[PDB]
Amino acid sequence: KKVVLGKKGDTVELTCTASQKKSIQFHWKNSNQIKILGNQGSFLTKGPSKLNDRADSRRSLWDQGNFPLIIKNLKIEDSDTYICEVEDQKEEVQLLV
Amino acid sequence: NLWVTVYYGVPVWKDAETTLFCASDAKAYETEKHNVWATHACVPTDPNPQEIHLENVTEEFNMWKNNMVEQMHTDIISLWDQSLKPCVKLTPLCVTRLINCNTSAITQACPKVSFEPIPIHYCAPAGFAILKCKDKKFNGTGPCPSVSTVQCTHGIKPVVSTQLLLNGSLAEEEVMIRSENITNNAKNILVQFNTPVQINCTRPNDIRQAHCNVSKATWNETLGKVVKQLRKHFGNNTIIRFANSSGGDLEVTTHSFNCGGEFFYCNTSGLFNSTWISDSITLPCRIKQIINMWQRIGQAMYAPPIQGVIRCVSNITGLILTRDGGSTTETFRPGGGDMRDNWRSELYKYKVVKIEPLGVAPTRCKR
Amino acid sequence: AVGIGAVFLGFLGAAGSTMGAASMTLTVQARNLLLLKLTVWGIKQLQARVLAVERYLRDQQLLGIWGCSGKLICCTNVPWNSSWSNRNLSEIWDNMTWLQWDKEISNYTQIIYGLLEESQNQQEKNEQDL
Amino acid sequence: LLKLTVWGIKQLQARVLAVERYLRDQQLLGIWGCSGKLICCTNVPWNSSWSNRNLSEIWDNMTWLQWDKEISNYTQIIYGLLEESQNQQEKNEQDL
Amino acid sequence: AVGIGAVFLGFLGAAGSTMGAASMTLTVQARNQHLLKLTVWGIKQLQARVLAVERYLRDQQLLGIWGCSGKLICCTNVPWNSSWSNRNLSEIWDNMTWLQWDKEISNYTQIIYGLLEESQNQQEKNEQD
Amino acid sequence: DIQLTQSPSFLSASVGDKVTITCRASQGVRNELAWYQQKPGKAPNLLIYYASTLQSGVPSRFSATGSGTHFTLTVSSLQPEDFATYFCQHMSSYPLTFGGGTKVE
Amino acid sequence: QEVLVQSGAEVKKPGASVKVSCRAFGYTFTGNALHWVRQAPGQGLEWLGWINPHSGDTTTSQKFQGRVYMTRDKSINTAFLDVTRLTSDDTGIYYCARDKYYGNEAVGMDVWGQGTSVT
Amino acid sequence: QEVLVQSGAEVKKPGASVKVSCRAFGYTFTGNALHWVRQAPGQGLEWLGWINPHSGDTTTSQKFQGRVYMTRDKSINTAFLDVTRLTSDDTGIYYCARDKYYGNEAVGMDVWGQGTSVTV
Ligand SMILES: *[C@@H]1O[C@H](CO)[C@@H](O[C@@H]2O[C@H](CO)[C@@H](O[C@@H]3O[C@H](CO[C@H]4O[C@H](CO)[C@@H](O)[C@H](O)[C@@H]4O)[C@@H](O)[C@H](O[C@H]4O[C@H](CO)[C@@H](O)[C@H](O)[C@@H]4O)[C@@H]3O)[C@H](O)[C@H]2NC(C)=O)[C@H](O)[C@H]1NC(C)=O
Ligand SMILES: *[C@@H]1O[C@H](CO)[C@@H](O[C@@H]2O[C@H](CO)[C@@H](O[C@@H]3O[C@H](CO[C@H]4O[C@H](CO)[C@@H](O)[C@H](O)[C@@H]4O)[C@@H](O)[C@H](O[C@H]4O[C@H](CO)[C@@H](O)[C@H](O)[C@@H]4O)[C@@H]3O)[C@H](O)[C@H]2NC(C)=O)[C@H](O)[C@H]1NC(C)=O
Ligand SMILES: *[C@@H]1O[C@H](CO)[C@@H](O)[C@H](O)[C@H]1NC(C)=O
Ligand SMILES: *[C@@H]1O[C@H](CO)[C@@H](O)[C@H](O)[C@H]1NC(C)=O
Ligand SMILES: *[C@@H]1O[C@H](CO)[C@@H](O)[C@H](O)[C@H]1NC(C)=O
């Protein structure tokens, strides 16, 4: 699985590549199965997690298949394994501080 | 010993994915901007609808893998691109981890036009047929025993609204809960009422303010019906809670719709606040000019609103709710925004089939 | 018991009935298979009528290829091979719908069409010529 | 192009209506058991309650107009009998 | 020799092939500004479709008068003349194309059509009565 | 006509009993007779057709037997919702006529 | 789902004629034969007639010929029954009943109306 | 004018799969069957198999099953030969050939391509 390094107080991005190049309903969840962010069609929505105002995404890459997650002001608690759900595919990305 | 005979006209069908013509009811002189789209793409309707109730045959329906939602969607995108011309468009283009995207910008002459939805039928061409599930307790998927052949459907209303369903069709028996997969925490939950909730949501004679009233008692009884129906699926002992929203853009975290050629963004913080265990409410709408288009990725800038009175009254008929599955109690944060869910809830009992009237059978005939 | 005659179930109205009773009403399901407004609305109706007539003509020509022109029910000369989901005639004609039959035959139907086209009208013909 | 959108639609409609009428008549003959024959002859017996005369008188002393004026009371029973007593009676015995 | 089966020569693909070889492939020749887009481009194609349908129906009606209804290879009861350029059947069916056979009886086609349509089918259906 | 006589007419029974009620015909009607129930103030409801087959929606605790001119139905367990009037009617030949009535209590 | 919807109760004088309608919901009206039946209060069921809603042919018992007449309307899917020379013995409740109609024969009456009261 | 155009010279490592193409010009593509013929350098020509371009049926000899695959494309009039599991003995030239195909039987090979050179 993919493992990424991280530093405290810095912005990190995680990629989640789909098969085709259009816009597909996806979601980002943590290991506790709490929603972080996702798209309802052509918009952006966020979850009830603790990373509500520290997790954005690049809107223009949704028309290329990539669904990245951008985390700003990273802390000690943000080191989990992150699950990306798209096209009945669950991708695991391990993040550490 | 026994041989083969062909039979012409046998009653069989296969699952097809063809296109359909609309055939709405256009007046061919009105400047509604729904009618000028209808008079250039729809033929007039049939005043004698054909309905043939079938015998004891069960059909395996499907809701979330339909192939009329994607035919609704392109037609409504064509309507919104040929009807409401915006002033400034911003669509990302991004010609191809080594990539950079630039935003295009076109400028078009933007007038202010009328805007109101008209009822639209969907009628299949010759050779095909439309099956309708007449079961009043339909789960949404699986088999349906009471199927009926319909020439074409009722008048659907192309409502454009997140966070709430406006001017929709009603259920028969009680409030119904439809989902692709409960206990997934990623699929939307569609809720259909059995009574309409009246909402009067208008701009009084500050221009960027709008008072938007709903009745408290009918909303309370509707939420009681909703919690009574939701308690069946979760164990009948779990108290649920209605939160407001969780972040997102302004076109999701509020209730956003169109009222007379203007974009209304009304808050829903005063509706989903109660916790259910075992006279009127006003809403602060802010009319906008910067919007995110639901059809594609991009931003749109429009004109200042028309001075005067802008009044619209409508029926709230359905809800889109999303569970917040954690680690007990459960929370239903009402989200939505994907517009396919705003048409899959009203096209949930229809199927397109192709007749193949040519069968073969073994008999004892000769020559 | 006492009776009065037949009834009229409608177009595609016998799909739930058995094969031995839905084959008597093939006539009903074979009968039904056949300025700005003058530019827009009329030409779509005209195209729909032309498309329906042409589909019926193509399908009747495909019936006429096998030596079965015009008739709703006719007999051919290929034998029923036992690998094509063999059953008794009573349970086929009394306990099945036509939908279940085309569910149970759909893996082999193109072979049936090819055997009907290659034989019969190209085997009764080219043998009567010699 | 004003001559095309006025004089073209009506003539095409008339041609399509004539083609559809001829195909409906040929479909009715195909249901009756005569697929393409002009004169065709069937299995239904001629009941004598329908008005019979001598064979020389019927085939030599009447126009078709007088015969169609005379038989017009009893035409639908003839049509139903020619449907059922041929193509629901010759069939269901060849399927034995 | 070894083989797989038949091939698809084309629409008019069997022209030039022998008479018996083209007699098995008669199936492949018997089977064959929004307002401005629906006034010149949308009516000529419809007229062509109606013309093709009406031509096929009138020619199939001309087949149906001869007693063949809707068959491809039909058979009738008319004696073939010792005239009309009679040869042995092997040279007709194994050496000549259909084009040369139509050019050989180009003069004598109407007599054959009058023998088929008139005084045979009316005579046969008179004999049936 | 054809006369249908029920036997016996008025019954008293407790909850959970075995009851068999009889319909007699003046002529042999094979099996072409059907069994109905009418509640007071409501329309009659169909229970048995072809004298031996259960109507869909009828509970399985009811049954019906019989041949020739002697037909019966049997209820294995009486319920408070099963107290109404029971009728028998034939359709082999004209006229269609019903039983005189069987009220249970 | 399959129900039969009629008109209201009627009160008529003797010697007159009364009209009752029955409309079908939930099924194709031209598919099953339709029966009419009466009830005097306190008596057993006795039967009037039955009609095909496709051919329009009617059939009545040996003691009501020329007394009742049955017609049909396929546009509104309504069957009409008319009773002439009303007497005191015709006072009662009215029912229209869909026959199940298996094998082109009479089988049983499964769908009923709610009864038209005539007096 | 009847010609067959093949691909260029391919270079390759052993063990993988390679694909060559043959496009027909000057005749209708669905009329005559196509043979595939291999020639080793310094040896004689060797025959692989043949495909009917209409029905899609392919026939291969008794010692290239699961190693040689044959597909067609009627929209662009092409025949694709897929050679898998490449060894050192497979360096040579490829020929696509039009059968004359008289009376639905193999008669002879009249039209040949310019050839495709493969080195492994
Ligand atoms: C779905 O809907 C279809 C039609 O819409 C229904 O099919 C009908 O089913 C009924 C029975 O359920 C058929 O009616 C009768 O079937 C009887 C079967 O015979 C047995 O039972 C009788 C009971 O008295 C015994 O006497 C007998 O000995 C057998 O034990 C017969 O009584 C009748 O069939 C007779 O007549 C026919 C000609 O009509 C002959 O071919 C037979 O051989 C036999 O002599 C009678 O037919 C009815 O026919 C069915 N309809 C059709 C069109 O065939 C389904 O029941 C319904 N439900 C389901 C779940 O599928
Ligand atoms: C374009 O033009 C050519 C003209 O040449 C068309 O005709 C084809 O011609 C060749 C021969 O030139 C046909 O080849 C076949 O040969 C088979 C065996 O070869 C024998 O040939 C002769 C006897 O014919 C002798 O020298 C000797 O016995 C050989 O053994 C024959 O079996 C073929 O058919 C013969 O036998 C069968 C069965 O007995 C008979 O039914 C036939 O009538 C015939 O006597 C034939 O001779 C080839 O088949 C011809 N094509 C046909 C007939 O379609 C081309 O067809 C034409 N088109 C194209 C696309 O090229
Ligand atoms: C019958 O079908 C089987 C399919 O397994 C086939 O192998 C066999 O050849 C067929 N018999 C014929 C065509 O006579
Ligand atoms: C002849 O016709 C009359 C009336 O049309 C009818 O009553 C009679 O039964 C018929 N008889 C025969 C043998 O067809
Ligand atoms: C054959 O044709 C000739 C001239 O066309 C004619 O005189 C002769 O009667 C014909 N014979 C037959 C049998 O048709």
From TrEMBL, chain B:
Superkingdom classification of source: Viruses
S-S bonds: C22-C42, C87-C110, C94-C101, C123-C152, C133-C144, C201-C212, C212-C266, C212-C285, C259-C312, C266-C285
Function per UniProt: Transmembrane protein gp41: Acts as a class I viral fusion protein. Under the current model, the protein has at least 3 conformational states: pre-fusion native state, pre-hairpin intermediate state, and post-fusion hairpin state. During fusion of viral and target intracellular membranes, the coiled coil regions (heptad repeats) assume a trimer-of-hairpins structure, positioning the fusion peptide in close proximity to the C-terminal region of the ectodomain. The formation of this structure appears to drive apposition and subsequent fusion of viral and target cell membranes.
Cleaved signal peptide residues: none
Region described as CD4-binding loop: 245-255
Domain notes from UniProt: The membrane proximal external region (MPER) present in gp41 is a tryptophan-rich region recognized by the antibodies 2F5, Z13, and 4E10. MPER seems to play a role in fusion.
Gene giving rise to this polypeptide: env
Origin species: Human immunodeficiency virus type 1 (HIV-1)
Subcellular location: Host cell membrane; Host endosome membrane; Virion membrane
Glycosylation sites: N56, N102, N139, N167, N181, N200, N220, N236, N244, N267, N273, N315
Subunit structure of this chain's protein: The mature envelope protein (Env) consists of a homotrimer of non-covalently associated gp120-gp41 heterodimers. The resulting complex protrudes from the virus surface as a spike. There seems to be as few as 10 spikes on the average virion. Surface protein gp120 interacts with host CD4, CCR5 and CXCR4. Gp120 also interacts with the C-type lectins CD209/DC-SIGN and CLEC4M/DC-SIGNR (collectively referred to as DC-SIGN(R)). Gp120 and gp41 interact with GalCer.
Modification(s) after translation: Highly glycosylated by host. The high number of glycan on the protein is reffered to as 'glycan shield' because it contributes to hide protein sequence from adaptive immune system. Specific enzymatic cleavages in vivo yield mature proteins. Envelope glycoproteins are synthesized as a inactive precursor that is heavily N-glycosylated and processed likely by host cell furin in the Golgi to yield the mature SU and TM proteins. The cleavage site between SU and TM requires the minimal sequence [KR]-X-[KR]-R. About 2 of the 9 disulfide bonds of gp41 are reduced by P4HB/PDI, following binding to CD4 receptor.
Miscellaneous information on this protein: Inhibitors targeting HIV-1 viral envelope proteins are used as antiretroviral drugs. Attachment of virions to the cell surface via non-specific interactions and CD4 binding can be blocked by inhibitors that include cyanovirin-N, cyclotriazadisulfonamide analogs, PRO 2000, TNX 355 and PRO 542. In addition, BMS 806 can block CD4-induced conformational changes. Env interactions with the coreceptor molecules can be targeted by CCR5 antagonists including SCH-D, maraviroc (UK 427857) and aplaviroc (GW 873140), and the CXCR4 antagonist AMD 070.
Family stated for the protein in its record: Belongs to the HIV-1 env protein family.
Domain Human immunodeficiency virus 1 envelope glycoprotein Gp120: 2-96, 97-367
UniProt-recorded name of the protein: Envelope glycoprotein gp160
Residue segments, region V5: 328-335
